[PDB]
Design a protein around this ligand. Structure first.
Ligand SMILES: [Fe+2]
Ligand SMILES: [Fe+2]
Ligand SMILES: [Mn+2]
Ligand SMILES: [Mn+2]
Lengths: 214, 214
């Protein structure tokens, strides 16, 4: 049918919450040493996400589009604590030291997840760049919901500042997903095919990243 | 640095306020038909300037360096009236109709100036990117003051809200220059020569733009 509806369908069937990792999470059947490996490896992506949005904005001449992209990037980076500071917090309440986090060498699967995002956001299809982000962010409110359930049920999280990252994204990425859907429309330049192509890589590139922990 | 001092000396020796264009403006010997052309033609630059910052930002891994760039871009784009809005206000108050401005074809002089800026900010030297903007912004605080003065002298500007773009930039660009000069230092990676070359190019490209109305 319509391509946004096809876009949502690729996402529905390659959705993170169905991977074995979050299946292992939904049922507690995960380990601390695993989630510490997950939190550290994710850190490359958290630092990189503001660049994804800068990349698209830098190539955009739709003034109204840039305001919406600047809105997201403000949410991600501006002020204290930003989403990065919020992710560091989470890593630390998992028993990891600041020196262990800073020294960690990003995995091959981690550097790979970032280059797919970065490839599309610097590509030639502005609509496909957004669509790459949308493929990640549209899942995060539901993922972050179950992450909070799994963190406090099984891994002994009592202080809710520890999972403040997932609390903010429970609500933040409902807006980002919705605003990004609009952005795809606004910036479409006959590149529906690239849009769905981007969706394909990101959905998989994430599945590859989550494989690494198992 | 010594090179920071050389960068400043380039700008001094090729300063926009010494151009014959702004000379005539300082002494009020400029015609309203010319100011309309200036204002009409500057539009492309005004709209592009956010992209210069996002471009640099999108290439940068110094997390502290990105916060400062985002601060500039917020000042430029976020909210209403943003710096584009304030430029449009100034345009119309010189007697231009919105369809004229939006219907204006931008000169090759303006396209080349913007192309030089984009070249450096999408170049491979972060410091030269910043330095290219810095060679623009450090001129502006002084320019804005003289701009407003000549406006209410020889071109009769009763209402200040007409020249609000200049009243804003008379003070904001003081901070932008200063944080840019800090960015140059933080981001440097043996490209001091690039920094100096970006400056030489940008100042000449700006002088070339002012020539097309004389
Ligand atoms: Fe985020
Ligand atoms: Fe500005
Ligand atoms: Mn988001
Ligand atoms: Mn400025």
């Amino acid at each position: 049918m319509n391509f946004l509806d096809q876009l949502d369908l690729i996402i529905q069937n390659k959705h993170m919450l169905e991977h074995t990792f979050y299946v292992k999470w939904s049922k507690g059947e995960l380990t601390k040493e695993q989630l510490q490996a997950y939190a550290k490896d994710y850190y490359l992506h958290i630092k990189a996400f503001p660049k994804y949005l800068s990349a698209i904005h830098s190539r955009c001449d739709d003034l109204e589009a840039r305001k919406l992209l600047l809105d997201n990037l403000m949410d991600e980076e501006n002020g204290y604590p930003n989403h990065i500071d919020l992710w560091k917090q989470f890593v630390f309440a998992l028993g990891v030291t600041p020196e262990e986090l800073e020294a960690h060498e990003p995995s091959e699967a981690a550097k790979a997840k970032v280059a797919t995002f970065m490839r599309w956001c610097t590509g030639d299809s502005l609509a496909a760049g957004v669509a790459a982000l949308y493929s990640y962010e549209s899942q995060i409110p539901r993922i972050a919901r179950e992450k909070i359930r799994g963190l406090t049920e099984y891994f002994g999280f009592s202080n809710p500042e520890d999972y403040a990252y997932f609390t903010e994204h429970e609500e933040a990425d409902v807006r980002h997903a919705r605003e990004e859907k609009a952005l795809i429309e606004m910036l479409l330049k006959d590149d529906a095919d690239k849009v769905l192509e981007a969706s394909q890589e990101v959905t998989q590139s994430l599945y590859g990243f989550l494989d690494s922990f198992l």
